[PDB]
Amino acid sequence: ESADLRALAKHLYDSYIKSFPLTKAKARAILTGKSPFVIYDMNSLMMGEDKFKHITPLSKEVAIRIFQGCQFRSVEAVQEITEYAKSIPGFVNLDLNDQVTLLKYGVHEIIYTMLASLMNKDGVLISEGQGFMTREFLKSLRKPFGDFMEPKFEFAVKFNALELDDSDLAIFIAVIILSGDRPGLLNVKPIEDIQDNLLQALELQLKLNHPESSQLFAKLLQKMTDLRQIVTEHVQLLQVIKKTEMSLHPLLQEIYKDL
């Protein structure tokens, strides 16, 4: 019934708000000016990290230091997504191996999605919106690091034209997690039953929240196409970096072994 779907939408929105540091609503206010430190070149990076816990010297080259800052922030997001997943109705009741599998194969798609909340066409928010690193600075990093950053902005600009808000994104993120086609799942049926409920709720939410945005539901599901592919391209970009170039303390490499 509608009430159950709206109750589920509100449940997920409230947990979404508690799980993530910077919401899209707050991020947009920063990006539009409605005041962060701007990193637009090398000198302003040095000042920005002398006046950001991901790009502090622990690798001396700047492009490497920014690249690992991306990894180290992605590890934080994984734990934030993991906590959020526990709030999705039915999730903690799934087989424990399947919970791990769902999170393992989903965090990459979800981090891409949620990164778009922090991006516009000119750059990206960092350190809870306290900093803003320009697209041009990231795109102009040397060797493959510059071509590693730009595809994220390319996706975000297109994803952002849907103009989803946080209440829409809370259900969408839950739909991605509850994907019954992840390899190695042991009991697909209850995962698909939950996702079917989340899809009903997302569908009703987009009708109520975007009544004049025709077939928005379909277009969001199509962005599942854009997401599986770029995560595919993303892993193959990492592999080229790993064989060509990065040394970290073996313990450090263990913390990041998944990203």
Place this chain on the structure above:
Amino acid sequence: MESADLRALAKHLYDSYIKSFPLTKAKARAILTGKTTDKSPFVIYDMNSLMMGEDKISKEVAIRIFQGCQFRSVEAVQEITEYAKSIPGFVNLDLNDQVTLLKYGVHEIIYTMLASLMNKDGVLISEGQGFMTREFLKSLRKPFGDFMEPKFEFAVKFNALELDDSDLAIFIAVIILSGDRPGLLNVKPIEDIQDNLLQALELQLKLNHPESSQLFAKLLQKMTDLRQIVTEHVQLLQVIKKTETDMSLHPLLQEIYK
């Protein structure tokens, strides 16, 4: 914190412990105490049964066994690292401090969780498919025999507390989040997390062992015995390393011991 937050944290950490560590104490105790047909381990107690064990479960035997321990210890480090990431606040810390905490914490945790696999007569191996007797390990030559036995000496005492996995999940989280590790940059955010974990441990032990008086203090005192056993272990491993050439250390362990 309020009780409900203390209990919610204990449940979180237990869930994650189960996801992170393939062989729980609950399963280890089922194997060790037996009474079953399907879970029965093959028992390695001498040279011939080790050979038969490696057919259903080359260097000198003591080196082979040491490499056995070394290989599991690296896997354990990997499992502990994964578990640490799930502790609320740990990944948000300064990354040098994350390294520093794992660096000094893993050995104390390995000893703790090794006890789960031990009784006074031996230790489970190959994910519980095998059991290697204490006497066999202790009779290995040169320095390798006395290198094995102190682990059993601690475990017999630690196991007298009768902790279960839900207790141990919080206890090993307290160990990791120790503010007195050398070289830490930001002691205060680590201590705030530990105080939360210590509160959680205290309530967990009172609810789970309500007839066990001062179990909390006794467990914290065991975090003393661990500081010493880890000291003796590394001082034995260094001496072993500069007398035995037939051992390389895994690069992960080599960097931890530096």
